Automatic annotation (TrEMBL), chain C:
This is V-type proton ATPase subunit a. It is found in: Cytoplasmic vesicle, Clathrin-coated vesicle membrane; Cytoplasmic vesicle, Secretory vesicle, Synaptic vesicle membrane; Melanosome. Signal peptide: none annotated. The chain holds residues 4 to 99 of 863 of the full protein. Essential component of the vacuolar proton pump (V-ATPase), a multimeric enzyme that catalyzes the translocation of protons across the membranes. Required for assembly and activity of the V-ATPase. Belongs to the V-ATPase 116 kDa subunit family. V-ATPase is a heteromultimeric enzyme made up of two complexes: the ATP-hydrolytic V1 complex and the proton translocation V0 complex. The V1 complex consists of three catalytic AB heterodimers that form a heterohexamer, three peripheral stalks each consisting of EG heterodimers, one central rotor including subunits D and F, and the regulatory subunits C and H. The proton translocation complex V0 consists of the proton transport subunit a, a ring of proteolipid subunits c9c'', rotary subunit d, subunits e and f, and the accessory subunits ATP6AP1/Ac45 and ATP6AP2/PRR. Interacts with SPAAR.
Amino acid sequence: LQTEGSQCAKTFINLMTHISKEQTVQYILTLVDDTLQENHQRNTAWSYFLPMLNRQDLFTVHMAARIIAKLAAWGKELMEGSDLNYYFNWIKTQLSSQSSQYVQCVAGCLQLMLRVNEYRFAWVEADGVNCIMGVLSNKCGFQLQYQMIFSVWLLAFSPQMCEHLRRYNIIPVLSDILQESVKEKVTRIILAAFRNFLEKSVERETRQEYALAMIQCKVLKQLENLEQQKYDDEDISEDIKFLLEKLGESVQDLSSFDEYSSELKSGRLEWSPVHKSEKFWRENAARLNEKNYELLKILTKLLEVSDDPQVLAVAAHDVGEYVRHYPRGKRVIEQLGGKQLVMNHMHHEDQQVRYNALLAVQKLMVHN
Amino acid sequence: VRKMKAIYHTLNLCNIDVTQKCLIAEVWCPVTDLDSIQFALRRGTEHSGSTVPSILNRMQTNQTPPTYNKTNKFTYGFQNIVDAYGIGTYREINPAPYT
Amino acid sequence: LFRSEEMTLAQLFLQSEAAYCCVSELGELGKVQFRDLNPDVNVFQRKFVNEVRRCEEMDRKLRFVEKEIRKANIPIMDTGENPEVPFPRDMIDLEA
Amino acid sequence: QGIQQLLQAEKRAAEKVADARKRKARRLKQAKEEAQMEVDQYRREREQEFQSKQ
Amino acid sequence: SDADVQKQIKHMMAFIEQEANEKAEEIDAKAEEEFNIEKGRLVQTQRLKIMEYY
């Protein structure tokens, strides 16, 4: 009972390797995992026990993975990151999702290595992060998804790693996990993963993580009813109010018309929350006339010359919302002949540009 | 929507939730109908993706139980005619087969 | 059928994740008598009074549409088929 | 009955969250006091360039 | 079946370790902002005191 375990470790390490009784060696490895779980030093010998492990038995592969995670994530001089880039490649086959009964356990061993900061930089470079994307694709992620979102939540702390992880479709794949919300602990870490993403960016490329991520997805509309629910854990109730205030400004800060001017002058006229928001059109009432009513005339020009199976419905929506907020603009589009263009474009074969132009042509003639 | 309102209405009827992050329900059920509810509840939790099957504990309290009668399309008219005067207690003879 | 049916007062242990799916399957079976554990509470603070409001406005808009079609006289076929209960992951998609 | 087994089981699950709430308010004080151990030490990190420019 | 009182202690106590470890390891993993990035606040403060001697 506490027996100043310090000596006889070299006799135990020699006994852990040389013994052909795998039943006793699994019991020897389980006693080492139980004892060293709450105590200190037991890393050249750590590299030595790795080659005798990871072979031909289901018990010793993850029990060594338990003790090699405890050895690598604990200790100052025991930090041996050169052995870490060595270690990841051997168990990467086991880290694949082709195994049964152990995909949950090695994910737990993966979280211990992903805890400390310098271990994370060498991880994601050697990773090929698609291993997380493989299990994030539907493969019965009841507990498995909670382990992997906890892994990427660890990857959000260091600032330069945030622009490393953004070369993917991460957050709308993650918001697809958020809309399920069955486990009630996957949503507490995937909202924390949204916070640790958004808070720790020193750049203006947080707006890269709204357009891909937040405003253009079914997450911000979901966060309104996330506030309405009755959660108990106090960090969640401050996680939603932090995300609601960060995304509350994020809808109108591009809802400026500048961006819209960046959209209109450069073209391509995409589907954006600046078009559906009425506080946009509450502001830019006279701003088309501030641009000498060319800013409307450049919009009907791209409406004229191009067929545009998607953005013509956006262009038909843009002339509709301006006309409701300025009655003299009805006379403006009559001088340009854009009404007869909407008359032609409402008879189009596509239903989205038909429905938008029908609302556009009926906004022109509310009162005559 | 009228089903989903009913399930959320009876979850308001369900547990105080102070005990754990789970729901407790003291429901009444027929004793001879007990294999069908357990066969349904075992695959009912499977749709939610849970590996933990919900369990059914039997109590031995002294609250008065309600009555229940096997009701057909034919004997329903003769049942509520008897039931209009007074509801039968637990295991009294129903006069409805004689009615 | 001269004696009775006999009742049990069993006790359920429903998990938080398996709270909608089991009770919905119990309703299709239809042989349970859910009893009020807390009668001395008001109409709110019942843990699920948030979206039972939202089911009522989804019912309120659907009562408005049912008035609208019969006002325009398009009599709708029934085609009698009892559908299955929608999951709460489909509940957010239903308001849209 | 079963809820009597669940009342102390909830309490030990709440207690395992409770001591985690206190070691994070304990190491937080130590995080500020381990960051000022460099005051003893990073003056010796200044000492190597004192010999270099001399 | 008398195994329900065993089934109660089987998996509802498995919910306890779901609250025990996975919620405390969440708080244990909240040290990169509470210990590591608060380390960087004061070691950058006394990095000035290296330069003022330098």
